[PDB]
Amino acid sequence: RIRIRLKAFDHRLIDQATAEIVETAKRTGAQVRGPIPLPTRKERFTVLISPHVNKDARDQYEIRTHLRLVDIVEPTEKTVDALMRLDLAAGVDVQISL
């Protein structure tokens, strides 16, 4: 019921943040689904660098924004009891949608 979709920057961070969620919801939360890769966006764009001149000087900066899904199916109350006001892997953004 809880369509869990989170967005983060790094994969080594989103995985570490989903680990605690998929441990809490299993020790208490009744058999959530499987973490879902959810293809991601990176915002590959061209920016510029040199002052005043040399238009041929550019930089290619990107922001790889990883996305993941869990989609808890059991509407047990222990799910929320464990997901009650916890924020791990600060620097990311999760959401609890039903």
């Binding site: 790094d10 930089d59 900066y61 620097g91």
Partner: protein, 100 residues
């Protein structure tokens, strides 16, 4: 970096959103498929008064620290020369240099 120019954006933005730009009550209603009555003139009746200072089309949508009309990015808030210096310094969450 003309203080005055930067102030100009300030007095522009200070009243654009405080005024008709978001309070678009007069124009929105008027320019429609309604009767071709006095409302047609009424539309510009207010605009002639309107401080020109205030509308979105007016503002340049430029940087804030430098006050530079060019190179600004609508998504970061600063010019190219400053945003790059901050990027390769670390003050841009999750933004780095990649290749293909």
């Amino acid at each position: 970096a003309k203080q005055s120019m930067k102030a100009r954006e300030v007095k522009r933005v200070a009243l654009a959103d405080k005024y008709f730009a978001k309070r678009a009550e007069l124009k929105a209603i008027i320019s429609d498929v309604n009767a071709s009555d006095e409302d047609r003139w009424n539309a510009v009746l207010k605009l002639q008064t309107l401080p020109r200072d205030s509308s979105p089309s007016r503002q340049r949508n430029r940087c804030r620290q430098t006050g530079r009309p060019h190179g600004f990015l609508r998504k970061f808030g600063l010019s190219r020369i400053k945003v790059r210096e901050a990027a390769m310094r670390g003050e841009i969450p999750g933004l780095k240099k990649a290749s293909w």
